[model samples]
Target: KYYGNGVHCGKHSCTVDWGTAIGNIGNNAAANWATGGNAGWNK
Candidate 1:
């Protein structure tokens, strides 16, 4: 499990599981959406 600064997953908060956050961010980047270069999701 992962623990971030906030209690929920948002633009500036997140607590993702093992490596799921990494993969999700990667997929989002590949999609070329607004979150392509975001990092808080895995913070």
Candidate 2:
């Protein structure tokens, strides 16, 4: 199964869960602005 980053998942149980990831693409008013639009914050 997919045990890590790059692994083969065509052998046993391929039922692997996906985690969360964030990124800023294009010009979407940024993620966490200082004096403008705020995309909120996270812990």
Candidate 3:
């Protein structure tokens, strides 16, 4: 179970739940799934 900024941007140093958070590799875009205290990455 992931919650808030789970493995977010290391450069930003901020939780992606607040913004972009690509859970995948080679993806500069925001995470596919994140928010409302939900999982940041998919299974």
Candidate 4:
């Protein structure tokens, strides 16, 4: 996760009721401009 510009840019992972793992990838490229970091997602 990356935090900057009064915002939190990151991703999250979760499992569905069906027992499938899911991942969400957020667009935090702006964080790179402010903090030089890139957010990622995984499951």
TM-score of each: 0.34, 0.18, 0.18, 0.15
Best by TM-score: 1
Task: Give the alpha carbon lDDT tens digit for every residue of 1-43 in model 1.
Answer: 2355433454423544434576566666866654664543443
User: Which parts of model 3 have CA positions greater than 4 angstroms off?
Assistant: 1-9, 21-43
Estimate candidate 2's alpha-carbon lDDT, on a 0 to 1 scale. 0.36
lDDT of 4: 0.32
Give the whole-model CA lDDT for all candidates, comma-separated.
0.51, 0.36, 0.42, 0.32
lDDT of 4 by residue, 1-43 (tens): 3343433333442333321222222223343443225343222
lDDT of 1 at 42: 48
Consecutive 10-residue window with the lowest summed lDDT within model 4:
18-27
Tens-digit lDDT string for candidate 3 (2-37): 345444445544454543433233243344434332
Q: Which candidate is the best by lDDT?
A: 1
Candidate 2 local lDDT, 1-43, one digit each (tens)? 5667544355332333422111223123343443124534444
Ranking by lDDT: 1, 3, 2, 4
RMSD, each candidate, Å? 10.7, 11.1, 12.3, 13.7
